[PDB]
Structures are given as structure tokens and as C-alpha cells.
Amino acid sequence: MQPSIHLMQQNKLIVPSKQTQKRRKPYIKKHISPPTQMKSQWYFQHNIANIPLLMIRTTALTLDNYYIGSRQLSTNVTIHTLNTTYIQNRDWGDRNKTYYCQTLGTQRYFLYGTHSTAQNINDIKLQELIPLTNTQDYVQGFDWTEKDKHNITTYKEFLTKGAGNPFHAEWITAQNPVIHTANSPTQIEQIYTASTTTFQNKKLTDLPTPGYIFITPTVSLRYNPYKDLAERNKCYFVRSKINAHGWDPEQHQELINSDLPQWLLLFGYPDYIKRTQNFALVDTNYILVDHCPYTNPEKTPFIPLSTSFIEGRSPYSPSDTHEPDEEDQNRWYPCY
Amino acid sequence: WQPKSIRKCRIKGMLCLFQTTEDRLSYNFDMYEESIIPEKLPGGGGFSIKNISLYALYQEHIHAHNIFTHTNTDRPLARYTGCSLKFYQSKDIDYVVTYSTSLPLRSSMGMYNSMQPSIHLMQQNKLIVPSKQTQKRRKPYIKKHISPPTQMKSQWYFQHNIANIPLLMIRTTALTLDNYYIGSRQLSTNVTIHTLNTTYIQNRDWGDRNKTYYCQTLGTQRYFLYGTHSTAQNINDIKLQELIPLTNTQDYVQGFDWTEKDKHNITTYKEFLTKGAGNPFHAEWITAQNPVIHTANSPTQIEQIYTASTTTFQNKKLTDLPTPGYIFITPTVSLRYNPYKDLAERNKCYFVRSKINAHGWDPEQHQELINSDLPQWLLLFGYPDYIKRTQNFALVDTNYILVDHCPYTNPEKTPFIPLSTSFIEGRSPYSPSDTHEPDEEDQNRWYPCYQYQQESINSICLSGPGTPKIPKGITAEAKVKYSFNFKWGG
Amino acid sequence: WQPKSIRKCRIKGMLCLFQTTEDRLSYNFDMYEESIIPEKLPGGGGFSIKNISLYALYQEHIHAHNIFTHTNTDRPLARYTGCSLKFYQSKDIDYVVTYSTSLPLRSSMGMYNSMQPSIHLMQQNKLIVPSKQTQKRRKPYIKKHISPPTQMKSQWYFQHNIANIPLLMIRTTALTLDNYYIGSRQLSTNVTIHTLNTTYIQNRDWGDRNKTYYCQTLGTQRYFLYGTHSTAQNINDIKLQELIPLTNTQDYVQGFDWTEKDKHNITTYKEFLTKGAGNPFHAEWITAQNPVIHTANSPTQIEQIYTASTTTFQNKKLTDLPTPGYIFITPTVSLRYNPYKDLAERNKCYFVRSKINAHGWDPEQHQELINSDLPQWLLLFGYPDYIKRTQNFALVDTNYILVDHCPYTNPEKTPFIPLSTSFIEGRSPYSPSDTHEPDEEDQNRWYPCYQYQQESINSICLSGPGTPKIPKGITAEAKVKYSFNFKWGG
């Protein structure tokens, strides 16, 4: 149905716009025969009521700006994506359950935001970090120094109230430094239950497991349809409401596409899935994924992210509403 | 002796000829669509060279831009009959086309020079495509039948035997029949060209933290440029503490005075030269907005002086340097040029390496890569892209730079040397006004180099007749529909 | 621009298409006439692939099978016009023909599969030649004119420049339009196939006097087959002295009991295994006419036992071996198969090396040499000869063996493994009944190998539709007269 492949289809009909071309009569008229199965005999009411008589396929295009619009700075489209090398947990949307980016073996890993001005990773103080500990909540978090502001008496209240959104505008893009580690905040729980005021001498390296890496949640890929083909690229849906890792299909192997380049391959695929499979919620229940080796920055599996979600704004609100709307305050997680 | 089974087969698809813009007016498109163009950087080209081959058509079908009327599977025999081209009218730009079917179909230096639109119209057997704005036709396309190449006879051939042989070569470029000799807001034809001041900037070795930059070397003595904030017009009273030497390139750093010693943790003047170094090409020094003094100082002399005593500079004057000569010399000058006042009695252009510690602007690479007998606005057109496609130099964009000789400017220097306005005003290329500083990527490449010639040589081309002066920030498309007739067999 | 002197020249001669027989029904003839076929061994083939070239015609003239109307001496220029073929009717067999003149004329795996007569008739642009018995025509030959290859134009060429280029490719096979789905004495369609019992015979390393043969190796334990003459059905009371181990292959030896110690000058049980070894594939053990017991004995255990004491075996029982398990396992089983009950939902066939000490019947040589989606009676047809001509393996006949997978037999084993009736009944191939023992030459090759698959895979092909079931011991000829038109020049 994508227009550029649609024109190649035989027995087509183009309708030039009045701006593109001025015709003598502003309409194209044709006679269409009945379906070849339906003979020219008589039938009852409510016996041919639901039988289709004519099926119309239409799409929009522009014969003038075929390969490029006008203000289009370039063809060179930027695609935001989840950093799938470290964000592998598909279970979001729970106040009670903390969010771990990935689980290697039986150890969970977490992302921590900090405001440290020192580039060293070992001197960053444990008080300054702002753990995620949740999703679905567009909350930016705050430092341990803000203990008095939110009526905090213990670090448990800090994690319940001072939790920050990993996907928040100040952390999704890594505008502020964010550190991935194997901290397992239960370790900090034990440390401050032993003594919470002793954190003045607690350093980032004192955690039982080493590894403190600046890992951004999302990266901006650069892509180009003229440089992209279809030697192996593929796309499909995966559930977003399960506590399982990996981005492989587990739902329906009949709902995998492949042998077209990305700009064609994506076209109409979500709506097709909506109409054919009738999944639980489609929009809210799960998410779409693809595999494309033809981007400048490439990750075996990919994962779109609208610019609105990356810049911290509700969808389809261009610039005026800089914060997520009232309705989506309880759904701000990677979702269709 | 026709084969047993034949099947008529057509190939129908839309081919995007070029997407051009003001900042990308005179570059070859078809070598840029294969390569990824970074976002927020205008690309494309105002002219394209097409070598349509059967393997190229199959590759296009892989990208899903065309269809086959009948598949060629298990029919190795092939037979070519001819092609039909439908040139669609662009909405707001004008393009002319021409096609050839000779034996070699090898692009040459003369062909790319002749690709410039005003000389392209003079070429015989042309075809103009008026834009819808320029003229409203009955049918918004020009259709013609093109015979196969005259060498390729009408016999049968194998698959992957005529795969790479060209069947049709298309030459296209953009123009504007209305604003032929001038755009509209074009204040005048009177184009300004920034150039390196080649009378004193003669060293071609940039891009080294360790090695200082000397503008020129006469005999065995090196000369250096120093920036100062002195408010006195006298050249002898300017204090030695106030000067800000260059001592480096490739670093967009503006420098600071000796009075700022405490700010950057400076204990010796060596730390001053390592940290307080300034870019000679910086926006506050390239244009000579602030005074800059050329001399034969040889900063090792100042090294000796302050190793003797650094605090004694309160009584050290500019004239105390062992070698005299302190001249206000701007790094770059703005020439005024006019294509109607310029001819081709001796002008010439060529490339020279930018990564060697040698002086002079003469060619030393390839005497076969010199052009001459056309005026500048024609002579430059497509010349860089020609060099990219033909010679395959090391990096082209980064390895070296282009130079010309033109006696027809108001201010004239035997050899010249473009400089895009972006590089002169201290901004990354193709960023119009918002990003006033060089980007993150080019912080380690801010030296005179081909990635900073772009807009200047493009404007030199643009000043010539027939250039499509479109509004800034808009992109113009040009689509062509191709129908190749084939007959698979076997 | 015709040459100065031309001379019309024809080439007339008789070409023997194939001489087939029941035991040689589905092999390519034209690769066997070049090689010497030993006397008293039927040869030929039921189908032939012909690549008639000018050099081939000259070679035929060297053998004096044709004539030239006019000599080509001192006339290097050549011109081809066309060929006329006269297909003579065979006396008592039916053959169909087809011809192609494409560019490559390279035989493929699909072509040789499609060569089987019942699928060959379905091919378009065919030609049937009824036998004189089947039908009496007015003129006992079919004559047609065949155009030159469509790539070869009607221009002039040099000698030894078109010498090796094919001019005409002939595909032929034998059939019988009368007995299409069944012969005559054919008791039934219900063909019996002997096969190696692959559930326990899994070792592919045969043909070594020094190395003993183990049927299979589970983990690190080897299993062996033992023949005995015990008249008691109990498996635990069978005495250890009565067993006759294999301990070798490639030797058609039946073995003997420990009681025959004196006959062969045996002093120790090592001499018993060196001399009293028996062939597991021998006529009295392959079919399990005499009981044979599979076990995990590992004869080194018996070595230890008799080195401790050899005369104490009077009290040694079969159960005293360190590892239990004594199963009556026949080396080969007779499957029943039917082409009308067999399809192609998953069946497959391929070759595997027979001269390696490795287990399993999976392919490890070439995944490009697997066939599948045809029923067995088609799938096997011409496949060995195709492999001979295309891959040029080490020895084909002796180096390795063929295997298939077919779930459609009454008794079914994931992988299968033909075995000609001759090898199962202990006789040399192609010797019907007179020579009851393997010949002198094959005394040192009597192991499962391609030289013993012949009649079985041939019978599998024969069971299919359209096979010319001729009487045993008769040979059928098929002669074709070819007339090539040429024009020498110079």
C-alpha cells in the first residue's frame, strides 16, 4: 500500500491535485463491473447484505516532491532508539516493583542519575546518585540533600519519593550523567540500615560489585533509505507487560515481515496487526521491534522512540505542552 | 535464429534525478546518494551523472524503486530493444537533460566543465523542461524513445554478460530560465570572495598540537602572527605581554593576555603558549577585527628572554626582538569579483596537498589535473567532484585543498584560495546563523581545508549565468520515469 | 561480405544412442562408452546425454563412424546452417527424445532427475519413437530439421575456434508405452529392498585386515556381532566356544567354531580371530539364516580371559561377559515398498564417505548434493551418474556409498541404505546365478560399497512408471542418423 511501490502496481489510477495539474473536468469517472463471482441474477435482501461489491485501495502521495519535500533539510532521518545492549527488561508500569535494566545470570543492574561535576567515576559520591527504582512515573528525582523538602526520615522514603524516571527528559537523552552498575539497591538498604549518617565516608567503589559505566538509555541513529536495502532486515511485535528479557519474537512466527527496506517494511504494519490479530490492547499491551544492519550506529535489534517521548512531551503536542499530559502520567513507559 | 521462448518485459520506475539547494548548487548528486549524508547537513547536488545498467536496474529493484513486467528467472538469454523516458516537470526549479549512447560513456574533465547550465544550453541536441511555475504544459511530462547504444547490436546476450555494460547515460543540471543572469533579492552580481592572504600565509602544514605554525619561511627564518588588544596605533609601543601568539592550528581557541596568568594555572610562559595559544583563523583574528601583527619573532627568542627572567617583561618592548619588522597583516582578505568582467585569458585551477611541511601554491601532484581556458564561474563547476570520481585521492575533503589563479578580481593575488563565509565568521559549515561556534566534531579540524571551501566555490559557480537561484532553505526535486523494453529468452 | 570460395559440406553417420538392459536401466550411457567395460559385465545405459560438437564430430570421424561430403583442408573459414536428425525405430524397445540449443547447455541435477521417462513424457516439445513391435509406421524413421543454437549467428568462424562449442544437445531415455505401469511376468509392483540395519550398523570404516569391525560405538564402548550354530533358543546358555566373531570386513570368509582348532593349525585364540574370523555380510550371516548375536563383548575381554586360561572355557558362559546385552540382530532387513503409495513430502537422498572411522548417516561432504522433493522411484534416477559427472569425487564407486531417507516403506528406518540382491545372496554383481561366490577381483572389497548398490537402486528406479521392463539377458539398441549442414570457406 506504500505509494512508491503502489505506483509500480499495474492497473492503477493517479489523481493529480489542482495545484499539481489543472484538468478540464476536475474528476475521473469510470464504470466498475460487479464482482466476477456475483452473476447477473436476482438475490434477496439481507442475503447479499454483507457480501462486498467493490474494494477500494487508496493512499496519499506527491508527484512533485517524490524523493524529497522542500524544507526537508536532508534525507538523512534521525531515529531515536532504546539502547538494547543494556535495556533488556520488558516489565514496566509498577509502583511496587523496581525496574532493572537487565539481568545477567541472577544479578540485576540499575541506572543511577547524578549531578557530579567531576569526570572521574570513582569519586562520585553515593549521596548524589538518584536511582530509578520505578517506571511509568514522569518524575525527575532529587538528591539526598533534599531530604527535608519531602519529609524524608529514612532512605526507603528516599527511594519511594526521590525516585527518578530513567526515561525522563533529563535522563533519557543523558543530558545529565547517568551511571549503569550492578548496585542492587538492597546493598544500600543494608548499608543505611547499619548506619545512614555514615554515607559521608561512603564512595561509589564501596559497592560489593564493581562496574560503573556511563550508559545512555537511548541513542540517536542516522539512517538513509537510498543506502538501505532488504538483505535481512525484519520487523515484528513483542509483549511489553511481561518480566522477560530478549527482543526475539515469542508471540506468532506468522507475524514477522522481512524482505523489503525499512521505509516500505514498516508501512501499515501496525494497523495490519490491529485488524488481523486483535491483540489485547495493541497500543498499550505491547511494542514493535525491528532488525536493521544498515544504520550508521547499528544494534542487532532496534526499537523506535518518537521525538515527543524523548523530549519529555505528550504525543502530537508540538511544542506548547512541555510536560506529559494528565492522562499519560501513569503510562510514561516505552510503549506503542 | 530466434530462441524458442520469448517474453516481452518492461521496467517501470521513478528515478530521483537530484535534490539540490543553494548551499549544494554545483556538486554531482549520484556520488552522494550512495553515501550517508549526516542529518542537519544539506546534501544532494545541482547536477547528476547517470550510468543506467541492467545490474544497476536490478540493484534498484532490490531497493524497491521499480517493477518488472515479467520475471527473468530461468531465462538467461536477453535482448534489448530500447528505452522510453518521461521527464516530469519540477514544481519550482528548471532542469535540462541530455543523453548519449556512445561506446565508452566515460565522463571526462571537459564533460563536467560543460555540465554548467549556461554552457549546457549551448550544447546541441538538448532538452529543456520548464517548471510548472515557469510554464504550464498540456501534459506535465516530455516523452521520447531512446535507441540502444549503437555498438550493442540487436542480437541476444547472456545474463551477467551485459550486466555492467551501460545502456544509457543521462546528463542533467538545474537552472532557472526566468532568473537567468540574476536571481531576485540578489543585491548585485558583484560577489565577494574571502581568500587566504597568500603573500604571507604560505605554509601548508596545519593540524598539530606539538608543532607550532609559522606563516612563511624566508631562507631559514620562520615568521609568526601575534594578536593584541593594544589601543595605540603605534607599532613600537605595543607591549610584549599583550601579544597573543598563534603557536598552533586546528584548535578553535581565541587566546588570552599574560594578565590572565592566574585564571588557567600558569606558572611559566611555556604554559602560556600551551594554554594561551590563539587560533589565527579564529573569528576575532581571521578577519582582523582585532589588530594582528606579523613579525620574525621566532618565539624561541621569547623563550630565552623569559628563561633569563620572566618578570622583567615590564621593561620589554616589541622592538627589542632580535629581528625587526612588525606589520599589520590580516590573515584573509575579501576580494570583489564579477563574471561579466572576467574572461579566460590565463586563469587556472587545481588541487594541492594540505598535510605537508612545504611552501608554495604551485601544483606538485598531477599536471594532468590542471584546468584553465574558461572563466572562473564555469571553470570551478563540478571540478572537485570530477577529481573525487577520477583520481580517488587519499581523503580529498580532509587530505588537501583547492587553489586557483585569476588576475580579474579587484584585489588580485597571483594564486588565490577560497574560504567559505562560515569558516571566516567562525561557524560550522551549512549552519546558517544559530550555531555561532564550530561544532563538536570539527573542534580538531579547524584549519584551511576542503571541508571549508564549500559555500565559497559554490557561490563562485552561482555568480555565473544560468544558476538556479532558489530561496534559501528550500529543496527542489526532479523525478524522471524510465521505461526499458526487454525480451528475456531461453 | 561472403568469402571467395565456399563448398557445401554434409556430415552423415550413424550414432548409437544407448544399449541398455534390465541390470543397467537408469545410468548415463555416454560416460560409459568412453571407458572400457569388462567382458561378461553388462554395461551401457537407459538414458544418454549428448553434446555434439565439431571437434566431437571430427573425433567420431577418426573412429570412422561418419563421412564428410567435402573435406575442410585448407579452408579455415566455417559456417553453420543447421542439422537434420533421423531417429530410427528400435526393434523391441521404446525411446523418447528431446533437444535443446540454449546458451550454456550445461546439465544440472534437475535435468537428470527429469530424465526419468514418466516425467520425461510430461515435458513439452517432446518426441516419441514407437518401436516396430509397438507400432508399424509407413517410414521407419522420424526426420526433423534443427536450427543452430540461437546465440550462434549465421556468420563465419575459424576452425578450432568453434571446435568445442556445442551445436546440439540430445536427451534420450528408454521406456515402454505398452507396459507403462507394469511389465508382464512382474509378479507385483510391491518391490523388495534389502537395507543395512542402520539402528545398529553405524560404523562407516571397513576394509582393514588389522582393524576389527565394530557395528556401533555408544559413548566409548564398541559393539560386535557374533555368529553361532546353537540349536537352543535361549540366549544365556549359548556357549562362548560356539560363537564366531566378525573381527574383520572386506574378507568373504564364513568362519568356523573353536572345535575346528586343529584344522587350521591354531594354537591360541588370537590365531582363532586371525583365521576363524567370519564375514558379517557373508551369505550365511547377512540374511541371518544362522543366528547372530549382537553384544558389547569387546573381544579384548575374551583376550584377557583366555590369556588367564584358554582351556577353562568349558565352564565359560555367554552371560559371564563384563557387559550384559545379547540381542538377535540381523545385519540387513528386507523392506517392502510401493511407488503408488509413496510421495515426496520429506524423502531425500545423498552420498556419504565409506572410508572414514566415523558414525552417523547425515551428510558431511556437500549440502549442495542433497535431493528431496520427488518420490523415490524418480528421485534416485540418474543421481549417481550426475554426481560422477559434476563433482568428480575420489573413486565414487569404491570411495563411498549412497543413503536416503524415506518414511513410506512398510518397515521404515529414518535413514535407509540400499543393498543389491547379489551382495545379499553372496554373489558378484551382474552374475545372475552361475557364480555362487564372489569373484577373484572382489575378494578384497566385499564390504558395503557403491559397486554393490547397483541392482537395488536400479530396481528402485525400475519400479516407477514408464520403465522399459525388457526380458532378462537381452540388449536393446537405438540408432540415430545425423546430417549436419556446413559450408567451409577460405
Numbering used by the authors:
A (entry chain b): 169 to 504
B (entry chain 0), C (entry chain J): 55 to 544
What does the paper say about this structure?
Our initial efforts to study the structure of an ANV particle, derived from a Betatorquevirus isolate called LY1, were performed with the full-length ORF1 (residues 1–672) expressed in insect cells (Sf9) using a baculovirus system (pFastbac, Thermo Fischer) encoding a codon-optimized ORF1 construct. However, full-length ORF1 particles lacked the structural homogeneity and symmetry expected of viral particles. Initial expression of the ORF1 protein in insect cells (Sf9) suggested a proteolytically susceptible region of ORF1 that resulted in the removal of the C-terminus. To prevent potential proteolysis from occurring in the ARM by trypsin-like proteases, we designed the LY1 ΔARM construct wherein residues 2–45 are deleted. However, we continued to observe a smaller ORF1 band accumulating below the 62 kDa marker during purification, confirming the proteolysis was not limited to the ARM region. To identify the region of proteolysis, we generated polyclonal antibodies to peptides from the jelly roll domain at the extreme N-terminus (residues 46–58) and the C-terminal domain at the C-terminus (residues 635–672) of the LY1 ΔARM construct and confirmed the presence of the N-terminal peptide of the LY1 ΔARM fragment and the absence of the C-terminal peptide by western blot analysis. EM analysis of the LY1 ΔARM fragment showed that the particles formed were more homogeneous and symmetric in morphology relative to the particles formed by full-length ORF1. With the C-terminus of the ORF1 polypeptide removed, the protein spontaneously formed symmetric 60-mer particles, as determined by cryogenic electron microscopy (cryo-EM). We determined the cryo-EM structure of the virus-like particles formed by the insect cell-derived ΔARM fragment to 3.9 Å resolution from 6271 particles and of the mammalian cell-derived LY1 ΔC-Term ORF1 particle using cryo-EM to 2.69 Å resolution from 22,743 particles. Despite being generated in two different cell lines and the presence of the ARM region in the mammalian virus-like particle (which is not visible in the density, suggesting flexibility) the two protomer structures are very similar (1.179 Å root mean square deviation when aligned over residues 48–562).
